[PDB]
Amino acid sequence: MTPHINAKIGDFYPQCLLCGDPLRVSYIAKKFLQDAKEITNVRNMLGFSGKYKGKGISLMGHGMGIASCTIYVTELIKTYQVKELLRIGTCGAISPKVGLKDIIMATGASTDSKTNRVRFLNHDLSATPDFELSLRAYQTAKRLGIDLKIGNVFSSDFFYSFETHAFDLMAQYNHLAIEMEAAGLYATAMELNAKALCLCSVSDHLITKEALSPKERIESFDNMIILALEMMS
Amino acid sequence: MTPHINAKIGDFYPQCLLCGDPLRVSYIAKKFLQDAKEITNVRNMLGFSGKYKGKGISLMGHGMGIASCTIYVTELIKTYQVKELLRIGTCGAISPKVGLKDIIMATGASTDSKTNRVRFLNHDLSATPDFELSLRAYQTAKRLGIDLKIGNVFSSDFFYSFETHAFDLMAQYNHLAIEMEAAGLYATAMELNAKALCLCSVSDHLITKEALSPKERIESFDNMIILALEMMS
Amino acid sequence: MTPHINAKIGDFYPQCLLCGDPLRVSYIAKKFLQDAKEITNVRNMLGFSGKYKGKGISLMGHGMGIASCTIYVTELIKTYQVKELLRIGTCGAISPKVGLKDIIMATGASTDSKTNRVRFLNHDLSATPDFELSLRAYQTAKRLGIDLKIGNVFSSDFFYSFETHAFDLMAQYNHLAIEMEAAGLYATAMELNAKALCLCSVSDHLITKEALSPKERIESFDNMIILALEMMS
Amino acid sequence: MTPHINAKIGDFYPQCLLCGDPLRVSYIAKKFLQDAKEITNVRNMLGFSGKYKGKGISLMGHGMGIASCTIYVTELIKTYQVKELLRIGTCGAISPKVGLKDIIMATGASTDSKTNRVRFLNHDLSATPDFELSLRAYQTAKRLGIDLKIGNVFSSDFFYSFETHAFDLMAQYNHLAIEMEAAGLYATAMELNAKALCLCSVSDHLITKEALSPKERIESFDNMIILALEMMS
Amino acid sequence: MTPHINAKIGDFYPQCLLCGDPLRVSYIAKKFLQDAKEITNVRNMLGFSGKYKGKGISLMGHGMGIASCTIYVTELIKTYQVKELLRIGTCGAISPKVGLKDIIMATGASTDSKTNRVRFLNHDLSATPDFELSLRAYQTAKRLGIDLKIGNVFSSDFFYSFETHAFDLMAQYNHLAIEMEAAGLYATAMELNAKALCLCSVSDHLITKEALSPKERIESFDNMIILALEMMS
Amino acid sequence: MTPHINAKIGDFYPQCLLCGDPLRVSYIAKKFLQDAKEITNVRNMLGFSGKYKGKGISLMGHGMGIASCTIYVTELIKTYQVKELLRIGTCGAISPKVGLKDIIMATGASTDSKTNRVRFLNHDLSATPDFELSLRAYQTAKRLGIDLKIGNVFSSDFFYSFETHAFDLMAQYNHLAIEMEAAGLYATAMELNAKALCLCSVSDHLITKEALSPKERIESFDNMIILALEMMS
Numbered sequence A, B, C, D, E, F: 001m002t003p004h005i006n007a008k009i010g011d012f013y014p015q016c017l018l019c020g021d022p023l024r025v026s027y028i029a030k031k032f033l034q035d036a037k038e039i040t041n042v043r044n045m046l047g048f049s050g051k052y053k054g055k056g057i058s059l060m061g062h063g064m065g066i067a068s069c070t071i072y073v074t075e076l077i078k079t080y081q082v083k084e085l086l087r088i089g090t091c092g093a094i095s096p097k098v099g100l101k102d103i104i105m106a107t108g109a110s111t112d113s114k115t116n117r118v119r120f121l122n123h124d125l126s127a128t129p130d131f132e133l134s135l136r137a138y139q140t141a142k143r144l145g146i147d148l149k150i151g152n153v154f155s156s157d158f159f160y161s162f163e164t165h166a167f168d169l170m171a172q173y174n175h176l177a178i179e180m181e182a183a184g185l186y187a188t189a190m191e192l193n194a195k196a197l198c199l200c201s202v203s204d205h206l207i208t209k210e211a212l213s214p215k216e217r218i219e220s221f222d223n224m225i226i227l228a229l230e231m232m233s
């Protein structure tokens, strides 16, 4: 009933977990939820509803990049009444103060996109998450015994960067890692008065080149999954 | 080998078709290819290698928006030696010179993205297709009896535009339609010394708000797929 | 030991409270601090060192605007070894979600300045405070029974705005009020790896035109001075 | 009848050739046209109407730089009803793919000018020729056994560049040569719904530093002159 | 020899008058100079040397627009050792403070070009004339009983503007008239350590549309010619 | 009468000297004026009225940075009917040609601020003083035998520059020094139709690293002060 979601109205709980990869959403729905039901699949972009420790929770893939993430979040909020958008994914660390398996909470999302200057008077929009959600994330991680890393991320239009020489200046200004959506998620949620947070686990270090093995990857993504479901409980 | 395609090095023919929607890809594999093999499925983004009248050809989804398109197109060219990239898809008409069913050949792709300024000295990159390819498309459509409409497209980061007041100016400067990736397709192929072209089928006119019925939407999309397969013959 | 500060090295405590107006700094010192000494007075810009419940506190004025603020923040951090910088002041509200007497915590500072494009690759810097400082403010407010309003502010180069028509768009994107230094404070503290936060008291509401009287302005600000002081004990 | 052109209305044929230098224009008329007459001479910028193998063709000089080109082209289309504009001139080649005596067809014109941002919403306008004209140039060229070199051109505001370090990157993005008008020609033609094409003779590299001798300039340019007159016949 | 001037080295005197129209340069040579000879004529862009009441002086055309002006004045300074460049021409008035026949001395030249951002770190270059020259023009005007209007001009890349709605804001900021080269003359003279000045005669009013009779233009331009020659005396 | 000035009606004379430092302002009052009265002191920013050689003159502090100077200058013109604003401040030299406590007259003020693009259509505002005021400076300085350098200054948002590599380019374009308010003064005075001029004494040399002290920045500048007083006589 939107050009990118074929769910029925009401099929989404007001809390939604987000990933770029629709197959990760699938993995989460099978392994971590009871009574999960696939509710959308336009363009193979999967969404699910189901229960986690008795509470209703929703999952939704959103593709890669600001433009794509912006499409699905816009529809999720405007048509399907999602109110809290918690978003999890991987990132390449650029700071010396984070390493493999760390979970980063993005209190800001810088960007090389033009999307926010187009949204916001051609000025600098400081794209930021909802504070109460970050507080629930901080509190839950302490309780779970996770050493939550906290700082800005840089949301890039480029997976294959042309500005790799600038990563140290980004790290100087407290950017812990690079991904590709958070500035879009945060700006859209600000645009539509909804609540958003982004969480990112370190799977590679772009400076010193250490990398997780493909099943070390899955163990640390699981650690992040559990943190996310726990803070929505 | 790449973080977004799980094909083996050697599975792609040098010619490749592209669509945002990977479900479009499999529909073309089934209904039009012989010996259609699936060769990649990372993040549900399906790819296919098959046969059309005895000649090899590939298919590949690339998701929505410039950032996603660039990732897949960069990896196709750099890792899988793809040489000719032909993008087909839908687009929103903005010009009185076009209506529903029309197929548009994009001789240039303007954009509201900052990606080309980042790539290109913060100047104006004129994002354009390979000429030889555009000639094939013109001759094939003449041989096939298709009244090819030719002009610019505007590639936007926004599906839900904040600048609809501007569509009239775009149309005046010979922009026939809007979509969300061609400027990225063209600049990547320009960057990596490969050949590229973008074809667009008109499904919705954004000015008159005419829309095709899905009985014609499959009808017109087939016309375009055939034109594209023909010019790769 | 800098062109703009004539204190002795060591005169500053590592926690420093900031106001634009040096006479506000003079007030706080005389009314709320023990054994307050004046440590700097270049350009009539007063800084102080004293105690509050036995614990050392410093105070410093920074003038109006990002450029003036940046000058003093840089010198405090670099020459005088200050580690936490807490800014408190007034602000014009622009959001319906806040009214007179409200204290705002700025979890992000947007801007019409070019300073952060100059510092940060001509990209978008998301200027954010230190998280631990923000959590300390949330907990101290809760303990004092203060109803903290959390969101962005907008830091302008213009007190006399040429863009008043834009305040509705800023409010929509969760900018709760307008002032003139937070973006430079946050970016300088980001640049030099120090901890910073901004707190804003609503005395005027730029949209609904409500306003506190001179005696209610004094009363309201005092409520913010005590939260700040309580935050540092 | 316009401030920059002296001709009576109807003096111009609907197909017009353009050079930057009005002495090229006078040269073309006396060696290749029959019954040729000077129709305009404001600011010494010569224009001619004449006959080539029976068919009436016009010639018009336009000066150097986008702003100059834009003045003349604007008056040709709006006042004197020229419909097709074929620009022929020299350029400095920057790509290894082209060498001396080569004729470049500019299928896109990049630029360091701000004019197209001012024309086009401060976005990227991809400035492009009319496809049909470019195909006629390709078909004519091959009929005359001229191997056309095809790609993008960079239209600069600077003859004495301050960014010579950037030429390698421009060449990477398929810019074959540098000149100073094409992006202004294409944009204006797009604005005013006219058909336009730029052709460029490789007199001088800029990288190799190879410059052909006095004898050859005349010969290579005449070659482009015949190409131009033939696709207009 | 330079690409755009075929004068002998040593042909120019160190003081040069400039006009965009080479036929204006010819007119001044024949009417006001003693023993004037033509020294250059590339691209029909005439230059002259001669004497004014016994003292040597040169005249040079430079076409229209910043790019064209910049080519010629660069070559005048670096190759032909011209030291003082005084540009005379017409403009369109935009301010109610000036009328027809008024002579404007441009103490600053704003622009919509990108050329000064390209020259100067993408900041704002304040393009200004040489102070001593503007003093000499002030004094000579007084001597001649000419009432000199003094202010900024706006140097536009557009003769046919797309921002006529902005003319009033320009006039508010002390822009007396619009023309097309002064920002380039000024920035090039600044780049190359020469002395430049621009004087403008009001032929037309862009707001109230008043105009001089082409009989009253010839007379008013003459006054400006005499001012320029005399201040070189 | 404004939120930043609390002077009585008519407390300001129509001529007003400006400093960034209100203590340099106070030092001029107490040393040079008869009947010196302090007419404002909001935020410790001192303004004074008094008499010099019989004629009544005012003095006003404006803080550091374009934003602060705009606030005070805007209020001086709109509420206190100041007509002539003469800034006499400090600046850092960026040439060996220029020594400490040299006095510069800024015929133009370039900037890295975005304030003038915000004010002026996102084009290049050429920020210049009132000519007659600068002629007064020139003739006054000469009658007094006070030496005066004349050129542009660069008005930065940054006292601690992040672009020290650019100083030679700035000096190349006739920028004699760096300061932080002249572009703000000049723009505001252009906006509101008032007469402004900026003089500045070299208080630092940015190549060789000499710097005066806070007290020397009040007391080493008598010649500039006397120059200002005399030109207002």
Ligand code: HPA
Binding pocket: F090, F091, F092, F156, F158, F159, F178, F179, F180, F203, F204, F206
């Ligand atoms: O170095 C400087 N930069 C800016 N303003 C100044 N005022 C004195 N020195 C300086």
